[model samples]
Target: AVGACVLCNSQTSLRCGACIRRPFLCCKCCYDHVISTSHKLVLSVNPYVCNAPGCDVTDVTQLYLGGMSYYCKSHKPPISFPLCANGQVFGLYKVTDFNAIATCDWTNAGDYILANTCTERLKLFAAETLKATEETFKLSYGIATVREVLSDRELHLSWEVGKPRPPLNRNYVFTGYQIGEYTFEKDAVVYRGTTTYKLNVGDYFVLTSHTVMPLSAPTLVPQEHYVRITGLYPTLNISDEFSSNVANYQKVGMQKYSTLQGPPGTGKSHFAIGLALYYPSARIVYTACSHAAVDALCEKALKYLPIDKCSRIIPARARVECFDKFKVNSTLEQYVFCTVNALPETTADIVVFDEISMATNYDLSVVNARLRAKHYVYIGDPAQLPAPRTLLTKGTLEPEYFNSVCRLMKTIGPDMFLGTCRRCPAEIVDTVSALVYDNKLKAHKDKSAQCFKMFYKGVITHDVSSAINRPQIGVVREFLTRNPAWRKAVFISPYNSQNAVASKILGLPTQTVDSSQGSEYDYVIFTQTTETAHSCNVNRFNVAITRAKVGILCIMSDRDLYDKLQFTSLEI
Candidate 1:
């Protein structure tokens, strides 16, 4: 009743869990079989490579990974399927990357593995993989290929196979956690658990017992497929988790919410632009703690998102413009897309909050309160520290947005938590996470990395990352003058006194820049200006510090004073 094609497999639909139909793949073999098959069509579940001539996985941009059709997050070509029937499968894969033998040996390895259109340079690595290792590579999901063979003779593996079906989110346990609801102001229910979770609209939490706790709706996920997207895991390399997470989001009708996070190099801003481009129907609101951070978004938009003509689409505005409807004379009459209100206020599908940790309670409260859209993404590194004392209210100077967000999260409850930090080095991220968890940030070793240390005006020689005994101050006549190519720069001080001192110490020319300008800057400088003062200026500074792109410079007034500024474990 069935005929076997010499080259391809006909199993488009099957019972195999690894079937593109499977939620979590059963094993890599089944996945390879179905995925490798070209459309020549037959029914079989076995390891096979689709090595149809000229086929390429790289060209197969949209692939069904873990049942979710993940777009090739990278533009590089997919390997050819030389082993498949028609050299393609599910209409998404090419037949060029195929193989029939369960095991591949470099000596006997057919042209498919050793030579293909996509991997023409593969022969280049013949010395490392050892045509022997390549030849001995058995084609199975469990078969771990060496990722890299160092000149020093270290063998790096590709990755281990994941579970066929990842366990239900409910099977895991989140200890020392509780739940609550939040309003505009503080709704206190203090718990002593070292771990806290922040929930946002439409987010959900699954308990250890498998109960799916639903978060309030107006949920921030896209209910439709705006783009074939995936998420990045900060902890895990080879992000198969994204494939699973996207599937979970889709099952719940949630939009994928993966924000780019990092210092300048991590591509958080680019991720935003990518989202905008991929989801054309989505309305993206980029919020920053400060005008300068806001400007960074603008500059990024100008370069990556652009005004027009691209695969990704982001709304372009003439200037910063948005005012809080609930407050009287709360005008931010400048050019920006800081909140959902900045959009047409009707069809916003996505909203992004940049420099999230830097945003003050008031700024965050205002932004969170106004997030009436379908998707919301926040990006920031809490380790970057907060705006100085002058920026906080009586009790807003805490370091844990995770706590504040946890509280707000109770209000917004049931949101997704990104598990990895792509920006920080593994060791740095580990140190930061440890500091955050143990509340022992004061003791962490300072970044020995040249970039963070170099060019400090008021330097501390402690060789550690924390505040020291002496405060340092550096200022320029024009903060924006550092780079003429930059749009504008914004300066923020922790205290008004230091802000005034900054005007002299850093030699800032003027205060023409204001939080309300909604104007973006090329650089954002944080000063210890507000440390000794108490006003909205601290809150203002929080907003201001998040508003630059070229770099963020924190000028400690005195190392002792900086040390005294406890980097608390709760958000402002």
Candidate 2:
């Protein structure tokens, strides 16, 4: 007889792919298991059976990966599972050249080795190379005393014999010090291996063969075999394709305009950066509505793009001297950072407008007229917040155009909608789907929603009944106080009139529905202010509930009012 499904306890039908190394799961569980993750799924053609040590059951489905046999769904590995090779290992290597070798699996591994025992070259390579290798590959360095040959036929070389020590530079001052691989303390005086000058404050430093020197100082230059340090450190190890959004964004060609939409934590910013990295040679201008969003996107941009490729579009009044790894300047530079009132230079190949919903129709119209890019990519959640209400009736620009340019643009890519919401828990996601999308959410067991009914006293007295026992505000406050690190939690009210009271009650800064747009939190506490159904517009409620990642706690001020809407308890 056919038994129940292994994952969801439904009838079993399918199994994971050969590489997955797992047993049987129902069709729904199989699909859900591999949806966000990289696990492969295959049909169960034969009877389900497993011969693994812990599990030896007949009538079972099977899968394989990394030589491990897993009968249950909980044992599946992450997408970055490392495969084995013949003795040769795979890992990251930070060379003296300030460049990080990502891995042997992706790039050239042999080129990272420093084969010589030269006095000057050996010290720098020995200090960090061994450490980096051990850190990345888990192979201990300096374990063997053999200098030339090893039992495993691996060549070994060291220059610890009578080499003259270079003097420390105590007077050198670092002018433009930034956080990278080799971090410096505020009061520590460090040495340059080749030079003998004392280090002082404000002295510009460059890494060359493990030696630090200013711009004018002479040192060993790059030869055919030797590699020069690329920069202070290598670019961060941010992957190009984090999720499905990246692949989808790449397909958006020279179409006049495109919009990428999703709820909070759907990685809209990541997708935007991926698009910029995909086209290296193409000139691109990245702009956002708010300074915080601009800083957030540019910080990631600096991690991925080279110093010259990307820059922040600074306003004219706020423009100042360029700082950091990449140049920061206004419209005068090659990659301009002009104000939103003025468009960037006409030479850009692609123009990316982030937080498109926050931009007014007039703002987009001015940008559209001046922006001469062949293609434009607008990224934002249209549901979160619309453009200014005052400018909606100006009659010069249409309301829809101001609300979302991507919505107005006819030819958008199929992958424009980001389906997955990484910020919220599964239960919160289901609630969002039910409330925002108007679709019945699949039944889930996670206690992500705590719906409470408050019996009104003086205002609107009533008896209250709830399907699930909910915790009091004082209890929630104690929980937050105990877990103080979760400061991202925000309390939200639908109306500004209730904002002050809600903020005072919650002991946290509360935001009105309009003000909370384009922001997210780890948890959301939605407090009911009024009794009318019109008080909680579905659109504003959608933005408020989607802000939470872990869970949402709805505090209904009136049980009678809540019953009018027929939302008893969230069906967790």
Candidate 3:
């Protein structure tokens, strides 16, 4: 030891050969200390001393703060983290390994698992909390703490188990472990249940799996490997098969902002399909609000596109697959067809948004934020069904219409209006046009509905209850029985309860009018109950009746509803 002895105050001193914390001792003190102390010693390193519990660095100078506790070095924090007086437990993390998650690909699986499950469970807790306000919520809740960890470097982690262990499902991901408002460093790993661990602030968490760091929302334009893109605008020559307006949309819409308004029976999907076909090399990303709409659009496009060129980007937990050959497991594909809920991370030349009217402004903004694009084309029927929260002035639209593409791009007028109603008979086209489209939309093909009928009866349990009318269901069942061979027929209603009843009893589709967008059927059985405000909405009626291409049957529970709906009657 270079310093003088502490007790004897001798000029030169010999170090005590014991635990590193022992100070140097002079000959006199060494003899006295040897007689007094009964600890074994055999270490020799002229290193700085520290009092941190589990740290063992002996070369660098130690840090003393508040003269309270000693820290080992600068690379590590003074306290457990910045090293506060009491150890602040910010969960556990392991050193980064030789895998893809390094610094860049960290995913917050714990947060995702918690967030995914909280939709149902947290709502229960929220309702219970609001009802009681009385006591702290007792039921366990798993929450992915929202705070983020931005660093792309490795984090300092302590792994020695200093406390009792609760053997949990270690396979669980532990990313973004919060509710305590804690987010770990930008390292990737898996997370588990909110044991909040039953342990307090200073408690140590056992690192069991690869818990990922929270993910930053990705860029739309490619820059990672740096990804590259082709054209600023689609310059391919469109086909003559397309109508003049459709051809004009492709021309003006390339690399510039454009919107295509498609009323019922109008060819919105066809325009999108044409764009994909005309400019096969032009990168395209097509998205919609609902899975059914995305799937439908993908199926339609597959009629022209090869499986390798176009593919649906499906989520891991998405509903059962009917088109595995056409779907890529992740965003690993180039041309993407997916719901706005799950978008690909890569960039596309033109992002075609179908059923754009169904997406909320905020949702569309967020979806667009993920991609940098040259030309963004929107195609939708704004006059049709809006979100449940959308406001309706009188019977027509335009109060707080924040969900539709028309609303978002209101400053820029629509580029194309699909005028000819090709899917319905002239009778349907004339009626729907006058009632919804201001007669601008007319029948392209003169035809008659194969079968058209409206069945009515008294309201069940009064219209205020909005319960399913057994008689309406009976009428639909009788029609279904008579036309059992109409396998493609579907029943649609505005109410979830009615749809539920129809699906369970009739053993038919689970689709409500809201989910039935971008889809048309051979026959549609619609239930519109009356004496209530719900049946009065013009959008719901529009979506319900237009779903049928061949025929439509409206089963009303009240006569007033029938009178109100007669204006949209196709059986002129």
Residue 493 error for model 2, in Å? 2.0
Off by over 4 Å in 3: 1-239, 243-246, 317-322, 327-333, 390-400, 408-413, 447-457, 462-466, 477-488, 500-510, 557-572
Q: Rate the local accuracy (lDDT) of all candidates.
A: 0.35, 0.44, 0.52
* 1-572: candidate 3 lDDT, tens digit per residue: 45444434454434545422244444444434433343223122322334566666432213333243334554344343322122211111200110111111112322112211232222222222222221112112223322232233223333333432221121122332332212232133222233333323233332322222212232122222212223544434656765455455455444355667788878777777777666666678888877767777787777766777777777764333435557575454557887775775667777888776666443455466566676677788767765432111233334124343554334444667889878876656766777667778878866544545464754464323435666677777776776675546788876655665677688877566776766788777787744355665666667777777777677765454465443334321
Residue 328, candidate 2: C-alpha displacement in angstroms: 3.3
**lDDT by residue (tens digit), candidate 2, 1-572:** 33343434456535444322233445544444444244443445443334245654331222323234323233335532321122211111102221121111111222222211122222232222332332332121121112332222122323123432111121112222221112121112222222223332333332222221111111111212113321112224335465454445444562455667655667787787776555544566777655655666676677766667545555553322332455656443333443454355465666777777676433454455566665667777655565433211222222232332533432232237666676666655665666554442332334444433233222322112101112334444554665565445677766543543445555677776666766777667666545444335555666766676565656555554344322235321
Best by lDDT: 3
Candidate ranking (TM-score, best to worst): 3, 2, 1
Candidate 1 stretches greater than 4 Å from native:
1-266, 280-294, 309-343, 355-374, 380-393, 396-493, 502-572
Could you tally the backbone clashes for each prediction?
103, 23, 20
Predicted structure 1, TM vs. truth: 0.33
* TM-score between model 3 and native: 0.55
Top candidate (TM-score): 3
lDDT of 3 at 251: 50
Better of 1 and 2 by lDDT: 2
